[PDB]
Amino acid sequence: YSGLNRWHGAGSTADFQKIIQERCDTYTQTIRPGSRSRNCQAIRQAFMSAFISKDPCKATKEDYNSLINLAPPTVPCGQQVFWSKTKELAHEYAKRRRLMTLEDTLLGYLADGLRWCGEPGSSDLNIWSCPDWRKDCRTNYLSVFWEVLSERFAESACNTVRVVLNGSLENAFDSMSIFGRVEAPNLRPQVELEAWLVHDTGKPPSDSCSGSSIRKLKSILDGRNVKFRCMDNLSRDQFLQ
Numbered sequence: 001y002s003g004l005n006r007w008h009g010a011g012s013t014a015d016f017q018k019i020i021q022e023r024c025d026t027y028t029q030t031i032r033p034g035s036r037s038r039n040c041q042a043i044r045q046a047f048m049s050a051f052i053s054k055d056p057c058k059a060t061k062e063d064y065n066s067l068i069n070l071a072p073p074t075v076p077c078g079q080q081v082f083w084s085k086t087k088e089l090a091h092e093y094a095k096r097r098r099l100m101t102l103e104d105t106l107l108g109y110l111a112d113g114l115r116w117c118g119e120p121g122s123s124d125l126n127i128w129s130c131p132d133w134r135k136d137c138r139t140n141y142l143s144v145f146w147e148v149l150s151e152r153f154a155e156s157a158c159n160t161v162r163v164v165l166n167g168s169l170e171n172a173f174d175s176m177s178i179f180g181r182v183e184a185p186n187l188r189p190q191v192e193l194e195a196w197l198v199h200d201t202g203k204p205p206s207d208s209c210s211g212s213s214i215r216k217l218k219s220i221l222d223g224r225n226v227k228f229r230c231m232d233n234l235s236r237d238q239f240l241q
């Protein structure tokens with residue numbers, strides 16, 4: 001645990017820079033071409049500039065101001081999908097219904113599933129290791145990116161929003177998740193949130209709308225003046241149907 005290899009987390013996604021420029025081209029040309037052209041070279045440059053050659057445990061939200069202003073994670077009213085511990089299911093649901101998760105916005109699509117960090121006084125990505133959230137530091141560029149992006153995504157929500165939660169976990173709602181700490185607490189009043197608790201096929205559900213973790217969610221939303229409807233006791237096929 002010295003030099004570039006000093007961190008406890010996996011190193012940066014190998015080939016990160018090429019991956020994000022490839023993804024930007026796919027997004028802007030093939031998947032969700034926009035009203036005006038975007039320059040993917042410039043977006044990639046802004047992404048790199050946010051974190052390259054800096055202390056990987058001193059990341060702040062402000063470091064991403066330029067990048068986020070370039071491509072705010074905006075979704076039409078009524079079409080946003082939040083999710084927690086249901087990644088595969090939530091994205092299948094959104095695809096079928098023509099809705100948008102955070103990973104369907106430009107920046108979310110770029111970064112989905114990747115890791116990155118730099119090193120002070122170096123222009124290269126650190127492929128040896130990167131800060132682990134728990135074992136090294138929470139103020140790292142990967143963690144901070146998702147916090148900032150998710151907050152903008154939440155603030156942006158209007159009309160009815162849906163959250164896909166895991167009915168096969170003890171607690172479907174985790175107050176310390178990004179959804180619980182950053183997204184739910186930043187929904188605007190008059191938003192209406194519908195929560196779906198979906199359990200594994202062939203298995204009995206483990207948490208429900210009347211359980212303790214959902215009471216915590218209900219309390220957040222009450223504070224924000226957000227109407228809440230909770231649906232549970234269903235599996236993947238019924239949910240997707």
Ligand SMILES: *[C@@H]1O[C@H](CO)[C@@H](O[C@@H]2O[C@H](CO)[C@@H](O)[C@H](O)[C@H]2NC(C)=O)[C@H](O)[C@H]1NC(C)=O
Pocket residue numbers: 085086087088089165166167168169198199200236
């Ligand atoms: C609820 O969460 C569980 C546990 O994370 C999910 O089951 C995991 O699914 C992944 C990918 O399919 C597998 O790699 C793991 O083996 C699974 N773990 C367990 C404990 O089964 C499950 O898919 C989630 N359920 C829903 C409906 O989203």
